[PDB]
Design an enzyme around this catalytic site. Structure first.
Site: not given
Ligand SMILES: N=C(N)c1ccc(CNC(=O)[C@@H]2CCCN2C(=O)CNC2CCCCCC2)cc1
Ligand code: NA
Ligand code: NA
Lengths: 10, 249, 27
Positions: B43, B99, B197
Site C-alpha cells: 500500500h 499487504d 507503514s
C-alpha cells in the site's frame, strides 16, 4: 523540512 | 510511532526509508533483506482509494538513516529502483490482505555498521515466536501521535490473541495478518502510525540471537487508541511469494 | 548467513537498552 539530498541521486 | 522512544544508533540497520523524489518527502518505512532487496507494504506503492500508484522512477530508498530529515553524510546510502514487485493477490479493495511488496535496487548497497539486512523467518522460528504475549519491535519515522520525529523511533509491542484482534475491529482480518499492542488493562501503550507503514515488525530469536522480521506495518484505526491494535502483514505466510520473486529475478 | 546480526550490537556482544524486554516476553 527535508535537507536537500544530493542532486546526483535525483 | 506513538509512545515510543528514540532509536539507538545502529539499532535497526535493516531500517529503510522510502522517499519521494519530487516533492522530496517520506513515503514509507521498509526493510533491507539482502544487498539489493527491500521489503515493504504494497500500500506504500499502490493504493487506488488515495490515488497512490508509484513507479520505480518516482522513488529512492534511503538506507542507514537515523535522522528523519537530514542527509546523513558519510552514513546513509540512497539507491534507485530496478523494479517494484507487488503481491499478485494484494487486497487493497477490502482489507489490505497480503499487504506486501519487494523492491530490487539498481545496484547493490554496501553494508556498514549502520546498514545490514534482517533475517526472514523459517516455519519453525515463525512457529516458535509467533505467540500471543510475545513482544516484537516496531521502528519508523511516522507520526508521533494520531507530530514528526527528529530521529528514528522505536517501540516494543506484544502480539495479541487472534479473537481479540478480530473483536477489536469491523474489518475482516485474515491468516496473513496479525495484530500487536497493549490492552487498556496493561497500562503501558504504544503503536505504529501513518508514515510507519511498510516498516518492520522484528523479533530477536532466543535460539540463535538473530533478528527476524515477523511483520510489516500495514494498518490500524487511529494511532495508539485504547482497545484498538496495530495490524501487520504476516511475513512467514507470504514467504513462498518472497522466495519466488527472488529466485526468478 | 549473517542476516539479523547487528554490527554495533550482536557483533560486538553489546545489548541494546530494551532488547531484553523481548527476551523476557519469550516464555
Ligand atoms: N498501527 C497503527 N495504528 C497504524 C495505522 C495506519 C497505518 C498506515 N495505513 C493506513 O493508515 C492507510 C493505508 C491504506 C489504508 N490505511 C488504513 O489503515 C486505514 N484505517 C499504519 C499503522
Ligand atoms: Na470484529
Ligand atoms: Na492501541
Amino acid at each position: 523540512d527535508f535537507e536537500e539530498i544530493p542532486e546526483e541521486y535525483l | 510511532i506513538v509512545e515510543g522512544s528514540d532509536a539507538e544508533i545502529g539499532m535497526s540497520p535493516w531500517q529503510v526509508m522510502l522517499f519521494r523524489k519530487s516533492p522530496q518527502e517520506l513515503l514509507c518505512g521498509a526493510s533491507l533483506i539482502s544487498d539489493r532487496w527491500v521489503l515493504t507494504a504494497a500500500h506504500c506503492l499502490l493504493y487506488p482509494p488515495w490515488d497512490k500508484n508509484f513507479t520505480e522512477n518516482d522513488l529512492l530508498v534511503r538506507i542507514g538513516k537515523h535522522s528523519r530529515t537530514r542527509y546523513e553524510r558519510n552514513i546513509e546510502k540512497i539507491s534507485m529502483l530496478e523494479k517494484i514487485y507487488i503481491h499478485p493477490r494484494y487486497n487493497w479493495r477490502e482489507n489490505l490482505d497480503r499487504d506486501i511488496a519487494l523492491m530490487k535496487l539498481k545496484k547493490p548497497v554496501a553494508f556498514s555498521d549502520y546498514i545490514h539486512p534482517v533475517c526472514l523467518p523459517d516455519r519453525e522460528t515463525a512457529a516458535s515466536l509467533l505467540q500471543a504475549g510475545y513482544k516484537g519491535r516496531v521502528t519508523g519515522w511516522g507520526n508521533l501521535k494520531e507530530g514528526q520525529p527528529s530521529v528514528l523511533q522505536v517501540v516494543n509491542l506484544p502480539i495479541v490473541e487472534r479473537p481479540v484482534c478480530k473483536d477489536s475491529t469491523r474489518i475482516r482480518i485474515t491468516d496473513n495478518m496479525f495484530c500487536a499492542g497493549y490492552k487498556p488493562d496493561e497500562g503501558k501503550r504504544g503503536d505504529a502510525c501513518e508514515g510507519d507503514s511498510g516498516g518492520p515488525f522484528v523479533m530477536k530469536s532466543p535460539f540463535n540471537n538473530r533478528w527476524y522480521q515477523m511483520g510489516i506495518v500495514s494498518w490500524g484505526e487511529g494511532c495508539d487508541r485504547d482497545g484498538k491494535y496495530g495490524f501487520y502483514t504476516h511475513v512467514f505466510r507470504l514467504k513462498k511469494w518472497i522466495q519466488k520473486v527472488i529466485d526468478q529475478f | 548467513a549473517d542476516c539479523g546480526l547487528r554490527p554495533l550490537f550482536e557483533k560486538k556482544s553489546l545489548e541494546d537498552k530494551t532488547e531484553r524486554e523481548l527476551l523476557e516476553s519469550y516464555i
